[PDB]
Amino acid sequence: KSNKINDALNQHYKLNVELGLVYAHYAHVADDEFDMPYLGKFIQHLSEDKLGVHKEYISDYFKRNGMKLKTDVSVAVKSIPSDAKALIQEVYARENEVRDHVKAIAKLALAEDDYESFYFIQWYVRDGLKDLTEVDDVVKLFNSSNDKLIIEETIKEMVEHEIWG
């Protein structure tokens, strides 16, 4: 059992918990302040994704290989973006960092010859791009229409691939 991999996956657990809490807030704001209930529903689904299987897969993995789970959570949402476009744009930036963190864990697993963790992280390698694509498909509506309700309608159909999930 690799201590560097244990640390990196504990880091990734933390990231998914805190991110999901930030998105929970961002979802509330999307509906309440920006008056976009469907954008909020899209961001709530991202939040429950991060606080669900993104963290559960790590703790299930630890039960199996002997690694230690660490719960150290610190998050405060102290400024909100100014409009809805900025808000989804901020989600996108956060999801791009996910792909960076995930790529670091994959590199580390190969360096440690941890092939069970390289296998395990392949899920996150794939989901890193899928969640970014979904967010990106939304950031793009704001560049195609000046009408919130046109955008809102298009998001709704998004909520209501053999390689990328």
- Report if residue 100 touches a copy of itself, rule: CB under 8 A: no
| Contact call for residues 50 and 19 (beta carbons, < 8 A) | yes
In Å, how far from its chain's centre is CA 143? Answer: 22
| Contact call for residues 161 and 131 (beta carbons, < 8 A) | no
Of 120, 121, 101, which is closest to residue 19 (Cα–Cα)? Answer: 101
At 44, list the tokens: 């709530």
Q: Using CB under 8 A, which residues numbered 58 to 77 contact a copy of itself?
A: 59-65, 69-77
Q: Using CB under 8 A, which residues numbered 132 to 161 contact a copy of itself?
A: 132-133, 136-137, 140-141, 143-154, 161
The correct pick among 25, 45, 85, 101 for binding a copy of itself (CB under 8 A) is: 25
- Report if residue 79 touches a copy of itself, rule: CB under 8 A: no
Q: Using CB under 5 A, which residues numbered 136 to 155 contact Fe ion?
A: none
Q: How many residues does the chain have?
A: 165
Beta-carbon contacts of residue 121 (< 8 Å; ≥ 6 apart): 102, 105, 106, 109
The correct pick among 21, 45, 81, 92 for binding a copy of itself (CB under 8 A) is: 21
| Contact call for residues 124 and 105 (beta carbons, < 8 A) | yes
**For a copy of itself, which is the closer residue by CB, 3 or 59?**
59
- Report if residue 103 touches a copy of itself, rule: CB under 8 A: yes
Distance CA 114, CA 41 (A): 38
- Report if residue 93 touches a copy of itself, rule: CB under 8 A: no
- Report if residue 9 touches Fe ion, rule: CB under 5 A: no
- Report if residue 40 touches Fe ion, rule: CB under 5 A: no
Q: Which parts of this chain interact with Fe ion (CB under 5 A)? A: 11-12, 15, 32, 49, 62, 72, 98, 101, 107-108, 111, 127-128, 131, 157
